[PDB]
Design a binder for this molecule. Structure first.
Ligand SMILES: [Cl-]
Lengths: 233, 235
């Protein structure tokens, strides 16, 4: 795609999220940069409305898969970069086991030289003293796989994965992610064969930042394409 | 699928000790940190305990614990590195810097109590006086790579090959070919794998509180390249 050429260097990123969970509103703004050749992202997020009413780890997946490292042999299967520069809509339902649900809608696109992710998030049916609204999640993150398949009828993709959030008592809070992406433009996009992305995330704090915030390093790498060749062999 | 796998289900402390000699320039490095194999994650800080490193930090990354790789459930029977524990394995490499010299390394990786220890000797020869390595012309960063692995039935271990791409300060790339062998230290049985690869990603940084010559490293290593029937069914 012509879109993949936009990612050959380090690209600045802007993230803007407006959220409402059980009526608790908040906004998050993030900035940083992405290096898709190595599949690497670094960002700092601030809650601009004061205190975040949910744990930061619950927002990581919502807060730019166009920065995934796609191996040379799998370039034809990178939908995210192929939709650029006009971009794509990413929508999810995230179901927290035994608790509430987030519904998200994001637009990911270039504005000038910057890759912007603008998100609206609505959360409902959370327990006021559950793991989420009770802030019982550890400030850390696990490695996951994002499973991707084409959705020809929407000219896009679907994905599924299950996030594991460590809870302060030693338990694990599961969050099922149901995802769809569709291009914003009408130009042609690449629809992939089935594959997955391996993800790793590291969360930290800036010691000179007084606002409620999260520093994030993330790696995302594509794998799992069965070429006819090795299916033969 | 091995007993050794059980030693890696949580966070394991790591100690790394390296003695090096590159064209007669001697040095030592000590590293400490921890590994979380469930997530394929390593966090370490290394100090050059002899003062200044005579080679670029990036050239030592690969030498300075693949037992911390995340193997997917369906590939756990191919995890040689964990299966050799706790007695451990010897890891040897020849690393050829294209158009420059060579490192030869020998390391023992094993548990000493609750700590996973990597103790290494490195000898470097034939480096060019004008070159990217002794000239310190390499950027302080690292790229993502694939480590290719195959069984070595004759030595009851494995062999590996990969090509590291080091960014050079003028925009070129300095290649480093890695040839690797691993063999178990103990007698116990080990898992000999089908061909596969490890996908690696690394971030180099500095600790603002540390005034010694040092490198902070975060790394992710995940096994791949062996498919499973449920994934293939729907392709
Ligand atoms: Cl250096």
């Amino acid at each position: 795609s012509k879109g993949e050429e936009l990612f050959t260097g380090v690209v600045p990123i802007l993230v803007e999220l407006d959220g409402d969970v059980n009526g608790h509103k908040f906004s998050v703004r993030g900035e940083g940069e992405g290096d898709a050749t190595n599949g690497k992202l670094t960002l700092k997020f601030i809650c601009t409305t004061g205190k975040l009413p949910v744990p930061w780890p619950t927002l990581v997946t919502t807060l730019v898969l166009c920065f995934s490292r796609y191996p040379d042999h799998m370039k034809r299967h990178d939908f995210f970069k192929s939709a650029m520069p006009e971009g794509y809509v990413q929508e999810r339902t995230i179901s927290f086991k035994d608790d509430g649900t987030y519904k998200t809608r994001a637009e990911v696109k270039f504005e000038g030289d910057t890759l912007v992710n603008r998100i609206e998030l609505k959360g409902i049916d959370f327990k006021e003293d559950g793991n989420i609204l009770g802030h019982k999640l550890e400030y850390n993150f696990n490695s996951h796989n994002v499973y991707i398949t084409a959705d020809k009828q929407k000219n896009g993709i679907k994905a599924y994965f299950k996030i594991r959030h460590n809870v302060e008592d030693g338990s694990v809070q599961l969050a099922d992610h149901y995802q769809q992406n569709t291009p914003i433009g009408d130009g042609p996009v690449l629809l992939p064969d089935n594959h997955y992305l391996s993800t790793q995330s590291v969360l930290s704090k800036d010691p000179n930042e007084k606002r409620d915030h999260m520093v994030l390093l993330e790696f995302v790498t594509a794998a799992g394409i069965t070429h006819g060749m090795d299916e033969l062999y």
